[PDB]
Swiss-Prot record:
<keyword id="KW-1133">Transmembrane helix</keyword>
<feature type="transmembrane region" description="Helical; Name=2">
    <location>
        <begin position="46"/>
        <end position="69"/>
    </location>
</feature>
<feature type="binding site">
    <location>
        <position position="172"/>
    </location>
    <ligand>
        <name>adenosine</name>
    </ligand>
</feature>
<keyword id="KW-0297">G-protein coupled receptor</keyword>
<dbReference type="GO" id="GO:0019899">
    <property type="term" value="F:enzyme binding"/>
</dbReference>
<dbReference type="GO" id="GO:0031000">
    <property type="term" value="P:response to caffeine"/>
</dbReference>
<dbReference type="GO" id="GO:0099171">
    <property type="term" value="P:presynaptic modulation of chemical synaptic transmission"/>
</dbReference>
<feature type="transmembrane region" description="Helical; Name=1">
    <location>
        <begin position="11"/>
        <end position="35"/>
    </location>
</feature>
<dbReference type="GO" id="GO:0042755">
    <property type="term" value="P:eating behavior"/>
</dbReference>
<dbReference type="GO" id="GO:0048812">
    <property type="term" value="P:neuron projection morphogenesis"/>
</dbReference>
<dbReference type="GO" id="GO:0035249">
    <property type="term" value="P:synaptic transmission, glutamatergic"/>
</dbReference>
<dbReference type="GO" id="GO:0060080">
    <property type="term" value="P:inhibitory postsynaptic potential"/>
</dbReference>
<dbReference type="GO" id="GO:0098978">
    <property type="term" value="C:glutamatergic synapse"/>
</dbReference>
<dbReference type="GO" id="GO:0008285">
    <property type="term" value="P:negative regulation of cell population proliferation"/>
</dbReference>
<dbReference type="GO" id="GO:0051881">
    <property type="term" value="P:regulation of mitochondrial membrane potential"/>
</dbReference>
<dbReference type="GO" id="GO:0043025">
    <property type="term" value="C:neuronal cell body"/>
</dbReference>
<dbReference type="GO" id="GO:0046636">
    <property type="term" value="P:negative regulation of alpha-beta T cell activation"/>
</dbReference>
Length: 390
């Protein structure tokens, strides 16, 4: 006395097709933008393109595969495994791309001087090619023998009248739930997500620490100037200048103007240090006053350009952290439900409508990333305008 299955099926099928169209259109626009604008052609966005290629494949293949496996049609169990598991291949690829982006950004903020030599486009494409081969091996592991094809549901296969060697193609009838929980969720999804959480925490820690160091060196320059103007003994000017020369060199360690600025700064510190060692207090106090002009016309510009760059890395890393968060928000419900089905055999199985609500929610993840770029990355947003208005 249940309502006809095709009614609820029509809603689910229609919602899936709507998601597939939006996932294809949005992520093709991402790939078109990277191809068009040279400012978007860096190593980081090569993983973003690999991320967009997987979401395009979700709408082109994974979502039609989801509609197919919802019917329970008769099929050879191994071809039925590919239909069920190919979305795991695409999802795993996205995990590798997201982990590489966070690692790339950690390298850009921990060792920015060595980034361009270490992280190159040739090495990135190799990483992406390797991670795609690993994603196939991980997602299609049930095809290697870790499946329930050896224990078919003979009642379901005879009721639907399947042929010899065929089974009723159902995700939970062919894909073992211990693979989905232990291997896929715990090892291949949950652990990499916790790793990205650790990488981003180190990124924000590295940014907060470097921002504090610039202010410490900047305040050390100005506070030690007051020590010189109010000094009385030659050693009071010598010790104050010694702690400035270190703060001057430790700050530097149109790019020649920033180097020429520290040369005048440290060159003036050595001048006053020579006068302070000779005992000339007044002549060293006046020599140290010339540092104020150099601080304004040179050092103050570096303080706020290096601060502006670090703040851009914080803002950009937060935008990329949202993509990881929305990935977790879209996929965790489906994983959590699998944990209930596997770990609590005495719990009632999650209802049909909730299963397909979680399945649909995981597919919406292929729609959100182009919106994050448009709202949080100006270079993506301006290129999106240029593409659309033209
Ligand atoms: C380049 C792209 C677009 C090619 C698309 C490949 C897809 C559509 C092909 C490749 C393998 C095929 C599967 C392999 C054989 C199985 C078993 C059969 O009993 C039912 C069909 C089924 C489930 C096929 C469904 C369609 C299938 C998944
Ligand atoms: C990551 C964020 C969105 C958290 C998501 C919470 C979801 C995944 C949780 C909250 C309540 C949970 C449900 C509460 C208990 C019921 C009854 C049980 O017989 C089957 C599991 C089922 C249906 C759970 C399924 C998963 C569930 C719906
Ligand atoms: C990303 C972070 C939040 C980790 C994910 C949380 C998961 C691993 C936790 C949260 C809720 C937990 C479930 C809540 C209680 C149920 C019922 C119990 O009889 C079996 C364990 C089971 C099924 C737990 C399995 C693991 C579980 C799903
Ligand atoms: C089976 C599921 C789990 C298995 C996981 C552990 C496998 C062990 C190690 C595999 C080596 C990696 C193989 C992938 C590399 C393929 C070759 C390639 O494309 O690399 C080109 C790169 O640019 C350089 O040449
Ligand atoms: C239909 C094919 C059959 C199945 C396709 C699967 C996923 C598609 C894989 C495509 C991987 C794209 C990676 C990429 O584009 O990275 C290059 C980067 O832009 C460097 O410039
Ligand atoms: C690119 C488009 C992809 C489409 C997915 C193809 C889905 C696979 C189609 C299975 C249909 C089938 O073989 O059904 C046999 C049925 O049992 C006989 O009545
Ligand atoms: C890179 C992956 C890192 C860790 C693997 C995650 C561990 C996967 C799950 C832990 C082992 C476990 O729970 O298995 C118990 C066994 O199944 C009793 O039946
Ligand atoms: C909501 C949609 C319900 C669709 C019911 C499936 C039967 C379609 C045939 C018909 O429209 O007459
Ligand atoms: C946000 C995405 C909105 C999803 C909207 C609802 C989809 C729920 C599908 C439930 C319909 C019945 C499922 C089925 O019969 O197979
Ligand atoms: C949007 C396109 C229309 C989708 C309707 C699904 C009908 C298929 C069915 O359930 O029989
Ligand atoms: C199906 C969609 C396949 C085409 C996706 C590639 C387009 C991206 C681009 O225009 O560069
Ligand atoms: C079927 C799935 C196809 C997925 C998309 C392939 C797009 C390849 C990337 C094209 C743009 C290259 C670039 O950004 O420089
Ligand atoms: C790119 C190619 C675009 C065209 C896609 C090709 C057709 C896609 C799927 C068709 C599914 C046919 C359903 C089989 C019905 C089984 C039956 O007739 O009994
Ligand atoms: C451009 C590539 C995408 C175009 C094709 C996708 C549109 C059709 C999607 C899949 C239709 C569902 C096929 C399920 C067949 C069930 C077999 C059965 O009748 O029991
Ligand atoms: C272009 C896509 C147009 C609509 C595709 C809808 C395919 C219908 C799937 C029904 C599955 C079934 O055979 O029961
Ligand atoms: C790239 C080419 C993509 C197409 C690859 C092969 C799809 C057809 C193979 C499906 C085998 C059907 C199994 C069967 O007859 O029961
Ligand atoms: C690129 C080459 C694509 C070749 C075929 C892709 C699908 C292979 C078939 C999956 C296993 C199902 C089967 O072979 O019976
Ligand atoms: C510049 C980078 C281009 C990336 C290209 C991505 C294409 C990767 C192709 C598929 C590799 C699949 C091979 C994996 C074999 C094991 C899977 C299995 O059969 O179980
Ligand atoms: C491009 C790579 C595409 C898919 C590789 C083929 C996956 C099939 C795994 C082995 C299963 C089988 O041959 O029966
Ligand atoms: C993420 C890391 C998760 C680590 C493993 C926790 C798994 C605990 C399950 C114990 C076995 C339960 C059982 O008897 O089936
Ligand atoms: C198969 C060899 C694996 C090692 C090479 C891949 C490089 C590291 C990949 C991810 C491992 C987990 C990353 C955790 C934080 C790493 C960032 C760091 O410590 O610098
Ligand atoms: C793996 C990481 C688990 C999450 C905890 C974050 C680690 C931060 C690293 C650090 O603070 O030094
Ligand atoms: C387990 C959950 C997280 C452990 C705490 C992570 C460490 C916080 C940052 C450490 C620090 O402030 O230096
Ligand atoms: C699981 C946690 C989900 C966290 C991701 C939510 C993103 C919030 C950022 C925002 O849009 O303001
Ligand atoms: C599992 C944790 C995944 C979420 C971590 C990303 C940060 C969330 C956010 O900043 O919105
Ligand atoms: C939209 C929110 C949808 C539901 C969230 C909680 C789902 C819990 C389902 C309870 C039904 C049951 O367990 O029998
Ligand atoms: C509903 C599916 C996505 C859940 C949250 C959407 C956030 C929208 C956005 O950040 O652009």
């Amino acid at each position: 006395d249940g309502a006809p299955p095709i009614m609820g099926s029509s809603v689910y099928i229609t919602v899936e097709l709507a998601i597939a169209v939006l996932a294809i259109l949005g992520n093709v626009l991402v790939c078109w933008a990277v191809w068009l604008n040279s400012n978007l052609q860096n190593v980081t966005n090569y993983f973003v393109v690999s991320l967009a290629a997987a979401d395009i494949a979700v709408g082109v293949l994974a979502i039609p595969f989801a509609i197919t496996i919802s019917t329970g049609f008769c099929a050879a169990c191994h071809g039925c495994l590919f239909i069920a598991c190919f979305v795991l291949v695409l999802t795993q690829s996205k995990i590798f791309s997201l982990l590489a982006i966070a690692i790339d950004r950690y390298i850009a903020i921990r060792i920015p001087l060595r980034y361009n030599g270490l992280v190159t486009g040739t090495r990135a494409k190799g990483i992406i090619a390797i991670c795609w081969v690993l994603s196939f091996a991980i997602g299609l592991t049930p095809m290697l023998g870790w499946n329930n094809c050896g224990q078919p549901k003979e009642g379901k296969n005879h009721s639907q009248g399947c042929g010899e060697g065929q089974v009723a193609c159902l995700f939970e009838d062919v894909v073992p739930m211990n693979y989905m929980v232990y291997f896929n969720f715990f090892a291949c999804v949950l652990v990499p997500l916790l790793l990205m959480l650790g990488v981003y925490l180190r990124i924000f820690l590295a940014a907060r620490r470097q921002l504090a160091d610039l202010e410490d060196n900047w305040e050390t320059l100005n506070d030690n100037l007051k020590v010189i103007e109010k000094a009385d003994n030659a050693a009071q000017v010598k010790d104050a200048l010694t702690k400035m020369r270190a703060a001057a060199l430790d700050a530097q360690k149109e790019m020649k103007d920033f180097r020429h600025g520290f040369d005048i700064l440290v060159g003036q510190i050595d001048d006053a240090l020579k006068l302070a060692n000779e005992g000339k207090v007044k002549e060293a106090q006046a020599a140290a006053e010339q540092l104020k002009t150099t601080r304004n016309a040179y050092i103050q510009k570096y303080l706020e350009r290096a601060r502006s760059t670090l703040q851009k890395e914080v803002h950009a890393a937060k935008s990329l952290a949202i993509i990881v968060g929305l990935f977790a928000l879209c996929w965790l419900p489906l994983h959590i439900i699998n944990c209930f089905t596997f770990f609590c055999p005495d719990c009632s199985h999650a209802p049909l409508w909730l299963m397909y609500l979680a399945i649909v929610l995981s597919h919406t993840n292929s729609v959100v990333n182009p919106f994050i770029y448009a709202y949080r990355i100006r270079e993506f947003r301006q290129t999106f305008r240029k593409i659309i208005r033209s």
